[PDB]
Ligand binder design. Structure first.
Ligand SMILES: COc1ccc(-c2cc(CNc3ccc(S(=O)(=O)Nc4nnc(C)s4)cc3)cc(C(=O)O)c2)cn1
Ligand SMILES: COc1ccc(-c2cc(CNc3ccc(S(=O)(=O)Nc4nnc(C)s4)cc3)cc(C(=O)O)c2)cn1
Ligand SMILES: COc1ccc(-c2cc(CNc3ccc(S(=O)(=O)Nc4nnc(C)s4)cc3)cc(C(=O)O)c2)cn1
Length: 1205
């Protein structure tokens, strides 16, 4: 048959029905996919009919004759590489030009503020100079007239050079803007052709880095005089102000000047802010002045708040005054209302002082559960662990130690008690005297991990602390230091929280009888080549699902984007769900199959945060299209206008009703729900419900199953984890069904947080659904799990419709009551602030955090400053140094890191990877640029801790610039979760999820693993065997040299086990292709991988086993024999792989969710849901356990050419 496609993937079926007419259909292995109402409906066919009784080609023709009508419509490689390479070259110039334009627009604003201040200076000068010249003229002085006019000559000459500089920059911007539009036009012509060419392929100071040692700054006095003052670059504003007022006595009109104590300095900054400097401690070179000038004004406003606002704006990367001028009431309501969360968190952590404040700053670092897996309890002997308690005596740092043997699960106070028992053994204390000495030490002291800042402040069993637990795993001696609480409490400054200064008829939607219509008026411009026609494509979406077929305006010549057309959507105003959004775009049609492409896009919430339906006329500035998005609309994108107004602006008009239209309140919804039920339980049913709740979030659900789930919706309460599948069964364009769903959700039973997190992704926009998910997290989500999943929870904030919601308030409360959560809460937000889509939401949330976070803001600012100097330095190497040989680059590195300004910033701060790790003085001999192509930085710090010798004496981080490390973070997160699953199932497989943190745009930090080498580095320690060929046995021989004696077997074991872990994990996730420089081995034999920046389907345009065991690894697993495949050790290696693969398959739902919550980000290789489907295929979810294991073997076989059977 013509419409029978046999076996084809769901992703391929969606591609054929995309943007088609209602009635389009096909059939596959049976399964009938039908296009209705803008969606693709799935109608199953049983071996034939749709439902009992069964009455094949026969029934398909009968229906060609809920769902109304259907069955109308059944369903060079050198040129693609030539067009694709050109497109990527234009995209490079497109983003560089886009970024350079932003810096210029900011510099124009700095020029405007500068010229405004200088124009004020001329006015005040003309004011005072006017009256005193007339007096001096009357008196015939003529010396004072000349002196005044002499200073006015310099002022007028100075202000003219600034106006000339602004005019010169405006013209350069005007030129580069026109160049940006042309680049935009060239890419808009290639997009349709490049897609078509690929489809057929498949068918077969400002500007000055630093100030000079002495600099000349022009001080603008309130009497109108401009005075030149030579300053040391490091001089404080205190010194500058005092010297300035000595020099002012040499200038005319001195007597008008008040005392210097009555004034402060104001100036302009590289961020184009007009900044009053209330803190006069600050050095001149640290002010980030736009130009070298200062204006003397009288201070206005609260001193302490202005000082704090500067510190906040530095951490945020944006001036706080920019939020003051936003006229959007939702923005100003969020700033004021979110302070309620700040006050609760501050009140909660101060409840029992100092202790609860210490619990906030140094929260216990602890595993999820006290229960130890069986093989871990066997590592410790008899149930007891040997720990070393250290005491510091005398100012000389001399340290006495006491070795204890105690139960693994005994608490920290019981450990301290045993230290006292061992010390007092010979003192012959009575039973009561021993109790008194133990109670004193338990009260006066706590335990601290030697080598970092980590403390046991809480009653958790000792084996549950991450540090002790790690020691048990690794077979290392725990080293703890006895420390007085009074020393820890003075280490925490008591801080107070001050409220900022900004703390101070209608109608019903369901009443309107009418359909939904929106008028498209016109667009200011678009960038296209005179492409044939353009049009505005619109649609109404709930989540990613359309609520009705898309509606287009009429086509119009590119020269004239005017429509003035009413678009009629099929849907009923009372049927419009609360979370419905309007998604629209401007598209072009090249004249040929009519290739379409999306010039620009934008989204709108059809109800504002007050539940008001949009009305009247609206102007919407649109957004550039994301890199690899070929769809004509972008429902995942963020709502709201583009803050950049230099971009195409579409004008809309919304239907008007006699008054304001509001969404109904809950009492009317429930009353409507009872009205719908009024006008409207077998063993196999209970088993089908159980079966539907097990399948993965991305599994297909037919229409017969959606009706089955909805008919049984009242019985679904007994299987609460089925809720996501039930929500998909709802018709969200019917208020009758949504009203009933609300009455279920409010009473719905709670569910596990890992399951509730799914309801926070882009598929579940509804407020009631989302509010239910957050209440689930509020009760059942521990601070440990919240830390693990924090990258996903921060990501789903983007899909929230409004600034003020339940999820934001939950996360901010937790960040402000837990400083380990707050640290990464801050950095996850700060890294995306470059992204203008989320920059306002995240900027506002960082402000609220920084106000209530307490004394930690000083430490965060220290980290932000240090990262800025590393970003600046590495960006220089990317541009200037990009050519010259690495021998020269290292000369520039050692020279730049030697600057005392650089040295002060990069020494004595906390590692953003692990705030518990203090970063001391840099060891510069160890600092280098790595020899890899991307040329990242290798940085080495001393550990300042007195006990550092017992943990590590050097901290090493890789600072990598130019790659997006959010993908590494997701992989390393998944690696860690995979290991915890395997560990709790009795499989001991060591994985190495080293720390990775993205601090900005394609910039971040990576933890260095000590005592590790790449396979390449190890083969080079060896020698050649065949012609121009490394020896296959070098790796195995190297491990023999590192592990000799009885420890040899332990290394081969650890090698084989860790090798099994990265075989399974790498195959499941589709990690980028492995090679000898991204694979590594420790001295003990533990194997791990690096360079995780690729995952899933990324080779789709251009599956596979990334990690392929070569002769080198098989020699180690089999302990150096010949024919490694036939050995019993390689069989045992395969068993580990098979068992570890099935373990992940059972947990598949968790990992699919983790990827789904990340869709909103700009990660290049995670774009649509079809990218996540790669994991469905590698885990063989739609298959069965027996078949899925056979699937894994066949993939390993084909990649290794035999050996698996
Ligand atoms: C259970 O559903 C509802 C929805 C709204 C109201 C409702 C309406 C109004 C005023 N709006 C309105 C407009 C058109 C007509 S119609 O009869 O001429 N057309 C039609 N009839 N059935 C359809 C189907 S469409 C009636 C009312 C007011 C109130 C109220 O006063 O509470 C409630 C009551 N129940
Ligand atoms: C769009 O305009 C419409 C839509 C539907 C209807 C409509 C009226 C009726 C009349 N009876 C009726 C039934 C239920 C209740 S309720 O209080 O329980 N629900 C609610 N109240 N205010 C709202 C608001 S919705 C109130 C009146 C019946 C029907 C019908 O059942 O088809 C439709 C009327 N206008
Ligand atoms: C994590 O512990 C590590 C990691 C790497 C090295 C290491 C690697 C190499 C050569 N391999 C290599 C491959 C990829 C890149 S990357 O910049 O493109 N991405 C990334 N880098 N680290 C990650 C992590 S991901 C850099 C180097 C050489 C050396 C060395 O020079 O000693 C150390 C040592 N310890």
């Amino acid at each position: 048959a013509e419409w029978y496609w046999g076996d084809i993937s769901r992703e391929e079926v969606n591609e054929k029905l995309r943007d088609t007419a209602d009635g389009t259909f096909l059939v596959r292995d049976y399964t009938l996919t039908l296009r209705k109402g803008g969606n693709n409906k799935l109608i199953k066919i049983f071996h034939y009919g749709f439902s009992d009784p069964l009455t094949v080609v026969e029934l398909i023709n009968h229906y060609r004759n809920k769902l109304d009508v259907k069955l109308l419509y059944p369903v060079y490689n050198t040129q693609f590489q030539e067009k694709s390479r050109e497109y990527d070259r234009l995209y490079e110039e497109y983003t560089r030009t886009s970024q350079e334009i932003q810096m210029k627009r900011t510099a124009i604003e700095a020029f405007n503020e500068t010229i405004k201040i200088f124009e004020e200076q001329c006015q005040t000068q003309e004011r005072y100079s006017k009256e005193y010249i007339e007096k001096f003229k009357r008196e015939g002085n003529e010396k004072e007239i000349q002196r005044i006019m002499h200073n006015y000559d310099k002022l007028k000459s100075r202000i003219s050079e600034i106006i000339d500089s602004r005019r010169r920059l405006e013209e350069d911007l005007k030129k580069q803007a026109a160049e940006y539009r042309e680049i935009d036009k060239r890419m808009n012509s290639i997009k349709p052709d490049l897609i078509q060419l690929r489809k057929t392929r498949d068918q077969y100071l400002w500007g000055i880095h630093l100030m000079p040692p002495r600099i000349l700054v022009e001080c603008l006095l309130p009497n109108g005089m401009i005075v030149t003052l030579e300053c040391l670059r490091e001089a404080t504003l205190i010194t500058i102000k005092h010297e300035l007022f000595k020099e002012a006595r040499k200038y005319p009109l001195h007597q008008l000047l008040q005392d210097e104590s009555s004034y402060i300095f104001v100036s302009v900054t590289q961020e184009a802010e007009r900044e009053e400097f209330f803190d006069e401690t600050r050095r001149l070179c640290d002010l980030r002045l736009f130009q070298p000038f200062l204006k003397v004004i009288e201070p206005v406003g609260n001193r302490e708040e202005k000082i704090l606002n500067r510190e906040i704006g530095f951490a945020i990367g944006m001036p706080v005054c920019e939020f003051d001028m936003v006229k959007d009431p939702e923005v100003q309501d969020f700033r004021r209302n979110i302070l309620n969360v700040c006050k609760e968190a501050v009140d909660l952590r101060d409840l029992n002082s100092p202790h609860s404040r210490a619990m906030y700053v140094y929260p216990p670092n602890v595993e999820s559960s006290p229960e130890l897996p069986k093989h871990i309890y066997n590592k410790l002997d008899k149930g007891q662990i040997i720990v070393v308690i250290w005491v510091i005596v005398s100012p000389n740092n001399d340290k006495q130690k006491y070795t204890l043997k105690i139960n693994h699960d005994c608490v920290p106070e019981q450990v301290i008690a045993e230290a006292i028992r061992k010390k007092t053994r010979s003192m012959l204390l009575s039973s009561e005297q021993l109790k008194l000495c133990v109670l004193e030490y338990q009260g006066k002291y706590i335990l601290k991990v030697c080598g970092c800042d980590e403390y046991f402040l809480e009653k958790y069993p000792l084996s549950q602390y991450k540090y002790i637990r790690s020691c048990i795993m690794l077979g290392r001696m725990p080293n703890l230091m006895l420390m007085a609480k009074e020393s820890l409490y003075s280490q925490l400054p008591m801080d107070c929280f001050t409220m900022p200064s900004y703390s101070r008829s209608t109608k019903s939607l369901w009443v309107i009888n009418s359909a939904l219509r929106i008028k498209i008026l016109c667009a200011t411009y678009v960038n296209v080549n005179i492409i044939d026609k353009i049009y505005v494509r619109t649609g109404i979406y709930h989540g990613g699902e359309p609520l009705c077929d898309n509606v287009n305006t009429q086509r119009v010549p590119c020269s004239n984007p005017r429509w003035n057309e009413w678009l009629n959507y099929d849907i009923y105003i009372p049927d419009l769900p609360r979370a419905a959004r309007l998604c629209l775009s401007i598209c072009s049609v090249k004249g040929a199959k009519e290739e379409h492409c999306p010039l620009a896009w934008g989204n709108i919430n059809l109800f504002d945060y007050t539940d008001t339906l949009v009305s009247g006329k609206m102007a919407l500035n649109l957004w550039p299209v994301p890199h690899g998005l070929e769809d004509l609309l972008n429902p995942i994108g963020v709502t709201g206008s583009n803050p950049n107004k230099e971009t195409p602006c579409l004008e809309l008009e919304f239907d008007w009703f006699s008054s304001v239209v509001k969404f109904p309140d809950m009492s009317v919804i429930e009353e409507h729900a009872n009205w719908s039920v009024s006008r409207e339980l077998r063993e196999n049913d209970k088993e089908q419900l159980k079966a539907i709740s097990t399948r993965d979030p991305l599994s297909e659900i037919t229409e017969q199953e959606k009706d089955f789930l909805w008919s049984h919706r009242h019985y679904c309460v007994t299987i609460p984890e089925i809720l996501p599948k039930l929500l998909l069964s709802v018709k969200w364009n019917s208020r009758d069904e949504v009203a009933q769903m609300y009455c279920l959700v409010k009473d719905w039973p709670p569910i596990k947080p890992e399951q509730a997190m799914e309801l926070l992704d882009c598929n579940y926009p509804d407020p009631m659904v989302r509010g239910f998910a957050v209440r689930c997290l509020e009760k059942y989500l521990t601070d440990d799990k919240l830390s693990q999943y924090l990258i996903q929870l921060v990501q789903v904030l983007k899909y929230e419709q409004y600034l003020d919601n339940l999820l934001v308030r939950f996360l901010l409360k937790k960040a402000l009551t837990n400083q380990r959560i707050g640290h990464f809460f801050f950095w996850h937000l700060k890294s995306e602030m470059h992204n203008k889509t989320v920059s306002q939401r995240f900027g506002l949330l960082l402000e609220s955090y920084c106000r209530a976070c307490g004394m930690y803001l000083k430490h965060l600012n220290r980290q932000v400053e240090a990262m800025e100097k590393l970003i600046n330095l590495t960006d220089i190497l990317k541009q200037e140094k990009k050519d010259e040989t690495q021998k020269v680059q290292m000369k520039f590195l050692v020279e730049q890191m030697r600057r005392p300004d650089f040295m002060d910033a990069l020494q004595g701060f906390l590692s953003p990877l692990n705030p518990a790790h203090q970063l001391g003085n840099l060891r510069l001999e160890e600092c280098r640029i790595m020899s890899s192509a991307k040329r990242p930085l290798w940085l080495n710090w001393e550990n300042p801790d007195i006990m550092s010798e017992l943990l590590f004496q050097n901290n090493e981080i890789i600072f990598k610039n130019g790659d997006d490390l959010r993908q590494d973070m997701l992989t390393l997160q998944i690696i860690r979760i995979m290991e915890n699953i395997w560990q709790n199932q009795g499989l001991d497989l060591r994985m190495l999820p080293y720390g990775c943190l993205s601090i900005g745009d394609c910039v971040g930090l990576i933890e260095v693993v000590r005592n590790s080498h790449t396979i390449m580095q190890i083969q080079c320690k060896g020698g050649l065997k065949g012609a121009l060929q490394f020896n296959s046995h070098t790796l195995h021989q190297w491990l023999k040299d590192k592990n000799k004696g009885e420890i040899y077997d332990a290394a081969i074991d650890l090698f084989t086990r860790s090798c099994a872990g990265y075989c399974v994990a790498t195959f499941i996730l589709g990690i980028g292709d492995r090679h000898n420089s991204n694979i590594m081995v420790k001295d003990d034999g533990q194997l791990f991988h690096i360079d995780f920046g690729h995952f899933l389907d990324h080779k789709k345009k251009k599956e596979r086993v990334p990690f392929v065991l070569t002769q080198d690894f098989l020699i180690v697993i089999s302990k150096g024999a010949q024919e490694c495949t036939k050995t019993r050790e390689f069989e045992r290696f395969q068993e580990m792989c098979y068992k570890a693969y099935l373990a992940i398959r059972q947990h598949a739902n968790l990992f699919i969710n983790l990827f789904s919550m990340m869709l909103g980000s700009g990660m290049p290789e995670l774009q649509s849901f079809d990218d996540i489907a790669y994991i469905r295929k590698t885990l063989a979810l739609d298959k069965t356990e027996q078949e899925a294991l056979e699937y894994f073997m066949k993939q390993m076989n084909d990649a290794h050419h035999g050996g698996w059977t």
